[PDB]
Amino acid sequence: MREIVHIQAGQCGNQIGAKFWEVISDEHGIDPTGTYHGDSDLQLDRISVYYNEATGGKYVPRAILVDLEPGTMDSVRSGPFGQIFRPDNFVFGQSGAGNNWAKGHYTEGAELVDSVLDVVRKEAESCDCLQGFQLTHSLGGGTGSGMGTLLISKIREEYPDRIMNTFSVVPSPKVSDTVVEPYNATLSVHQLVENTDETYCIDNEALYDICFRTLKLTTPTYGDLNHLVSATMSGVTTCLRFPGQLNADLRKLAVNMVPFPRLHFFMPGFAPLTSRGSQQYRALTVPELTQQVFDAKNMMAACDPRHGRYLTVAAVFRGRMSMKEVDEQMLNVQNKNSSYFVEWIPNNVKTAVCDIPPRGLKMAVTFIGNSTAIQELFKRISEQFTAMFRRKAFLHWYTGEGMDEMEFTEAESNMNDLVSEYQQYQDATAE
Amino acid sequence: MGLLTILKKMKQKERELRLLMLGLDNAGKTTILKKFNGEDIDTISPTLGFNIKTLEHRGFKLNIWDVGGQKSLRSYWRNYFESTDGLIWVVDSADRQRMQDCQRELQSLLVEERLAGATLLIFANKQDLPGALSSNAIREVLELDSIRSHHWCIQGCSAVTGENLLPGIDWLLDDISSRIFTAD
Amino acid sequence: LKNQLLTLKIKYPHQLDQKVLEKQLPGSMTIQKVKGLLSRLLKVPVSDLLLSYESPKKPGREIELENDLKSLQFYSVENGDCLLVRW
Amino acid sequence: ETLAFGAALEAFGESAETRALLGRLREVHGGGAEREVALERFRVIMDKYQEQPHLLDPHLEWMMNLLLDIVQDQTSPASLVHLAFKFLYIITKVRGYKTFLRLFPHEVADVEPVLDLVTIQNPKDHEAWETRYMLLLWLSVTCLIPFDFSRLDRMSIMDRILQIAESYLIVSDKARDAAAVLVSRFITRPDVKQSKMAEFLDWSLCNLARSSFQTMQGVITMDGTLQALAQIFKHGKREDCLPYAATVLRCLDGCRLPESNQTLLRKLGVKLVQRLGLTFLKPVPEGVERVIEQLLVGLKDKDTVVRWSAAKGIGRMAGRLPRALADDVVGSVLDCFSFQETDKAWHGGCLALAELGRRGLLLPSRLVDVVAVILKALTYDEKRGACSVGTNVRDAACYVCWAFARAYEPQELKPFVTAISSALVIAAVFDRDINCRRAASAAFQENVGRQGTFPHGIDILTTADYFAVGNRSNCFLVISVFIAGFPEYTQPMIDHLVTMKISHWDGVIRELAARALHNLAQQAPEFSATQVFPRLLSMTLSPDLHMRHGSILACAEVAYALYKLAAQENRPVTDHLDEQAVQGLKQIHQQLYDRQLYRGLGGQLMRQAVCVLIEKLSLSKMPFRGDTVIDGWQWLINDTLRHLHLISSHSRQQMKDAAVSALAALCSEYYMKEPGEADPAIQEELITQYLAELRNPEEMTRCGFSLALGALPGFLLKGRLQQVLTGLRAVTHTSPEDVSFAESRRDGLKAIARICQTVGVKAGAPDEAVCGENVSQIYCALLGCMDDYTTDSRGDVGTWVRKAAMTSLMDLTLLLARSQPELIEAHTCERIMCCVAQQASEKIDRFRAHAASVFLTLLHFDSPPIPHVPHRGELEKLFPRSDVASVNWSAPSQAFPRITQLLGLPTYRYHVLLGLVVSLGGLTESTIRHSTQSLFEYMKGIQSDPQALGSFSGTLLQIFEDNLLNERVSVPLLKTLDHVLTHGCFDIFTTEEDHPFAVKLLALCKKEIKNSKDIQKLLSGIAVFCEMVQFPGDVRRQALLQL
């Protein structure tokens, strides 16, 4: 049993984790009481990965809730599926952070890290064969930016033979009007480059542009984006909760999809994109769903993979379809002699077929790729980083707590080196 | 929770403060201490080095941090276990040469921030002597109109008819107690 | 090719004396091609050409067209929309 | 003109916006998105004053007066009531429920409405739990009023309240806390404690006796019962709980709380037994002992909250105990510092001692053991797994020292400070954790400030402050030396550093310790040389690898420091080090090779340590001239340079550089017979062994041997320079055998650069120095490497060779300027400048920045001025001496508008355009947009001029002709043509029919996309053929035919 411990940080992280658990519980067939009620044998063959067995056939969720503010803690606990969570995994503070990386990494963020480790150490002792960990947060505030990286490094040291995957959230000025946000985001990236195995960048600007153009929403709130985020997260973690022909776990996936330790930023995707309404248009076919999931319109990041080079691609289908049809499609589309040939779709794609369809949708495809287009986002962030470091505005807020000015220059140099390495690796052929 | 929460609870319960008092006139500080303790010589005269004393006044545990030097005072400004709540600077009125250094130190120490911060109390001793500047001249020289996030106040004093000093000390306590602690 | 055509109209807020003509451009047409067409069409420099679209399903909202490297299909431009030319 | 008050500003700044948002609530609940927007904005503003909620105290009355007025509306629907209750709950969470609710209406008549809304609450509704959470909290506020409940009279109001409390004390949401607050503030009433208190006690006993720890309901039930009992015992009199303080303990003893898995229940039981013990004593009796025993047992809990609760309980119980019992408890707490205990027990004991010292209930006779336990806790670090544990013990000891300093008087604490001062500064400047060091620094500052009379107290306080301790590297090199400058802080530092850091499980810590030893070694020569050196020589032969890794570092560093001290007095190193140290340092490599410790993954550390040891001993001029140790060192260096592919890539370059430095030091020190000569036999053998390995099929062997040969001194390259030059030139060249060996060729170049920099320029010496007889053979070899464009599965590896070739050319050019500048030709220099401009016109950010820095370096060199520079005046005018650092070449927006201006020069119009073609038709969106926006800024001045446009068209056309059948240049050029033809740049040529330029352009195209299968090439060809229809005549007909 390759168990995985899940950790939630920040308000955004807690909300995303709660929605993800809510989505996966209805798919696995778990009622709010805690027992099982599914009508299939494939829903319990891998239930020991994200859950634990207790007395009476209970399946406790394996997630930890940590924050410096209690408001989020109370909101979730009293939620629809909050009674199943373990009350001992609720570690919160009072003051918070106030959008400051220093207050969350060196001042108030270090007075709770030891308490957090207590829960982790104790939760990993009952696991028979631990595989890795997980963390969902955002790079905007101060709690999930400083305390998050701190706990990440803690796990890296105490447990250097395990796996570390994060689901960071890139902030955007179209949603938040914070000013120091960019700095905190960089300070988090400076540590995520070195202490992360796999990263799934979820750009808020791309989601806002999708909700303001495709879905046509007058005022896209937070839930309109959280729904798509939870749907994408449920689509990605399908190979880790249901078996298939592509037998792999987290270590094999990290080895096959990440060839270079410095290059590990992926771009997720999902099709079709539906809002929170309980409606449906028409059951899309396999080629239409493939073209929708491979198009730049359904990308979760504001980056066009057509201008980059694909490294490792892997798609996961969900529905009542057969592997023979998917193989025939992947073999017919990649033929230039056919009339349905396309160039904006790569060739090296690892296909996978799942039996259980998503909740509310009969057929849906999930896109996972490692395109070299994250350099655009890294340059957009570096633009804001340099347009505020020249005037030294709001820089005393970090130096008045204990931070050093050399950390910002080191982070900028690391970001520039990463951008240059991405630009150098974008041009690569093999003849 | 942790050590910081317990320290904050103890500070709110025992009503402990920390007033960083600076100055070099070695003449205007005696009366200030006399306001904190009925004594006149013991724990009243300023020291050349650095001494930490604790007095009780109006039910407030004032932790006076008397520093003699006026250079690189950022070491006393911040502390891993406790911060500074009040700042009292004593200068000379009939001295326009040593005022630029004090202004530069006050500008380098106090900085802008999001919320409120420590409270400043500028003292002007010896006003009856010829050559002393008024409140407007002191405000224009030190440039206190550009210093935000720190409420300042100029209090004059003299050996004769110095208009006392009770409101200048009462306003500091009223602004400090109404900031961290609650009225009711 | 006919099924991919977008029957959209052209309007000029600055010059209201011109008529609201309607063109049929392909769906995969880039923004740079439309900019070049308008440049010659109005003998106006293409450097200072502003592009926008308004759909009847969403009245009162104007979505601008800044990136020339993209296409009309990426901006959710459907059939029946209008193109605003600002210069 | 005396009392002047500074202008004041209101803390809260959303009063208006907030007032409008609270007033417009009647026109927001109708919509769904408006509700969410209002909720988000309302919360964000509240979160703004979260750190300091006390500033919103005056702004907490008008908001409540507008919210409760809407809640108390008899015509408002349930949706608006829930919306207002959510706002009230958010306000309570931001500020607090112990002060803000003191304003909630508490009048007899109000209690009835308060409970009525309560009986109508639906517990099975996750969308409105805030209403149920705030309703009980508001009902508690009302219970305070002093009025008989009967005055208002299942049937009675008190029975209904008790039933509601019992039903809400077993829920799972947040309401539980509110139910506990209600049952604590209502049961303890004068008219209620006579017929309900004991009744509830029996219910609580039944709940604690029937609930279990396996079920999910039982845990929550026990949690609620414990919270209710604790709150009742806290907010209750002493005479009431007295007749019932033993039954609760007897029932809790049978539940087995410490022998469970729940942490919250354990902490709640600890708090309950602490409050029971506090209530037992008068503000000794049966039961007090067991309570204290449970408190102690809990002091050694795994978690930290239980330890903190037990420490607080012990500190609160030590005050209400007699002298003998307090002394016994203090002794039992101090006895917890045993060797068989864990770090949790030590932390609990430290917290208990801190709680005891905070109240001043510690006898002066126990201070003797307090000092001992403090010294034991300040140095606590046990190895467990990969890292180590015990980082909290140091912080606990620092907090205890701080509390004891702020507790005892300066006279009562005089012998204590003089015994814990040396321990504090040491941890502050040498601890791995920053918090540990900062915590020690604050304690030392407080001790110096409170003691008054202290030596160098301000000297170190100012030098090391809360921020300085921030930089770790400096704490062991800069501040450490300044603190060690005093006689009372030199020997304890070196001893402690050697006994606890040189062997730390972290290699970085060991390197920092080795550097600190060398830095401090000078401040104490005699002691370090006579006492420390024997310990290092004894520890170099230890079975531990890290201890062996670190010790060897110290032996190398100290020896260098001792040599430096004796050289100032002009004495050999044999004065300080005796013959014993010389005999011990001669058998290190031999003993390491006899045990074969260089194998495995642990041999890399030994190979890195021995290399540094040889590098340090070679500069020390040790008397080992003519011994087997030199041959052994040479053999080991050769083996290290040969075996490089086995070592991981993470630590390969460092090992290679260390080996090269050690070889260069040894060849310069121990290989010299006469001043200016060398042993012919050893030199010839080394040359033969080094030139024969340049044909090895392994790339790592060549990469190592190139840097090994590129480090020989000047006298060792006399008469055999041409052979080494030819051997290095034969490697930089490429062949089918070695096409991807990019690294090897780059290493060969560098080596050439280092040799040219070390040897020098002498007149008439081709085989001895580098003059005009062999400068062209190096210039051509360096220029041929600029055309490297090898692409593999890893990416573009030609940049690694191009950067090396540019750096070598930069190091060579200025060399001629200082020595025989005449050697500088005009054509070669012009070609170098053109190549530099081409590499600067690329797309890579770092590569373009480096090329621009190289270009600005040779341009600003005017001592002496470099001759044969085309367009020097124009380049100086466009690139002034003041605009060097103000131009960020890493950003395309601050680089392209300055590079495009080079097209105006007839000399660089070819290479700059060839470089910009690749950037225009590249792949990055931002770079392409920047290049397109920068090209027009220069094209808009040569559009109307026919000659200037024709020259550019001819230049670009020639570029197209020179780069045929090359998809690396042809496709970017086609993309550039497609991006330019759509901008109408070439229109002054559309007036005439069949203009020369198009006739050639169209012809070149019909040859690039012939019998092709590339999709991008076909797309570019179609785009070009569609955009080239603007030329009338036969060109239009040919374009139509091609389409």
Ligand SMILES: Nc1nc2c(ncn2[C@@H]2O[C@H](COP(=O)(O)OP(=O)(O)OP(=O)(O)O)[C@@H](O)[C@H]2O)c(=O)[nH]1
């Ligand atoms: N997609 C998404 N983004 C969110 C959500 N909640 C917050 N954010 C974004 O997260 C960033 C702010 O970070 P927070 O979640 O407030 O961080 P925090 O660490 O809890 O905050 P502090 O402790 O106050 O620093 C902004 O970019 C928000 O727009 C959410 O539910 N979904």
Ligand SMILES: [Mg+2]
């Ligand atoms: Mg927050």
